């Protein structure tokens, strides 16, 4: 905090932290991969953030641009039931956390996403995200961590 600036939000976003709940969670282990992202305001009444998930030594890499509308004060973008996610924490100086909620064909699934400007994520970003996670319902109940095991799979056991 010091002076207003849209750029604060605009920049590089690093997706590493994730939290979800789904019966198909087991199947979602393979899909797990490192994730990078970049946010930018689309000059057409839409805001978009591209994310490039790399994982050559396991599968490959994927990129996708998601965009729609965004709220003031902080950052919360809607994208039809199928895609609904809100950017919270502190996407103004270096660390931000965003929770995603999917809704399609009458199906509800929860998934969180954490965008970090720099690898050195502040204790607040991680702690507040985890702490905030509980306020919503819990942490492990809805947890997920950047994959780091065999091929395309998250560390476990």
Swiss-Prot record:
GO cellular component, one term: extracellular region
Presence of keyword 4Fe-4S: no
Disulphide bridges, residue numbers: 59-152
GO biological process terms held by the UniProt record: defense response to bacterium; innate immune response
GO molecular function, one term: oleic acid binding
Main location: secreted
Ranges that cross the membrane: none
Alphabetical list of Gene3D superfamilies matching this protein: 2.40.128.20
Protein residues bound to enterobactin: 22, 83, 102, 113
SUPFAM superfamilies, per the entry: Lipocalins
CDD domains from the UniProt entry: lipocalin_Ex-FABP-like
Subcellular compartments: Secreted
Top-level lineage group: Eukaryota
Keyword annotations of the record: Antibiotic, Antimicrobial, Disulfide bond, Immunity, Innate immunity, Iron, Secreted, Signal, Transport
Binding residues for 1-tetradecanoyl-sn-glycerol 3-phosphate: 51, 83, 113-115
Function: Siderocalin-like lipocalin tightly binding a variety of bacterial ferric siderophores, also binds long-chain unsaturated fatty acids such as linoleic acid, oleic acid, arachidonic acid and, with a lower affinity, long chain saturated fatty acids such as steraic acid. May act as an antibacterial factor, through dual ligand specificity, both as a siderophore-sequestrating molecule and a lysophosphatidic acid (LPA) sensor.
Quaternary structure and interacting proteins, as annotated: Monomer.
Family classification: Belongs to the calycin superfamily. Lipocalin family.
Protein name in the entry: Extracellular fatty acid-binding protein
């Amino acid at each position: 905090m010091t002076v207003p600036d849209r750029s604060e939000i605009a920049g590089k976003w690093y997706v590493v932290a994730l939290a979800s709940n789904t019966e198909f969670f087991l199947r979602e282990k393979d899909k797990m991969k490192m994730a990078m992202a970049r946010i930018s305001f689309l000059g057409e009444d839409e805001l978009k953030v591209s994310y490039a998930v790399p994982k050559p030594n396991g599968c490959r890499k994927w990129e996708t641009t998601f965009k729609k509308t965004s709220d003031d004060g902080e950052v919360y973008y809607s994208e039809e039931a199928k895609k609904k996610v809100e950017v919270l924490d502190t996407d103004y100086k270096s660390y931000a956390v965003i929770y995603a909620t999917r809704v399609k064909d009458g199906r509800t699934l929860h998934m969180m996403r954490l965008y970090s400007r720099s690898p050195e994520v502040s204790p607040a970003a991680t702690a507040i995200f985890r702490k905030l996670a509980g306020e919503r319902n819990y942490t492990d109940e809805m947890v997920a961590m950047l994959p780091r095991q065999e091929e395309c799979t998250v560390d476990e056991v």
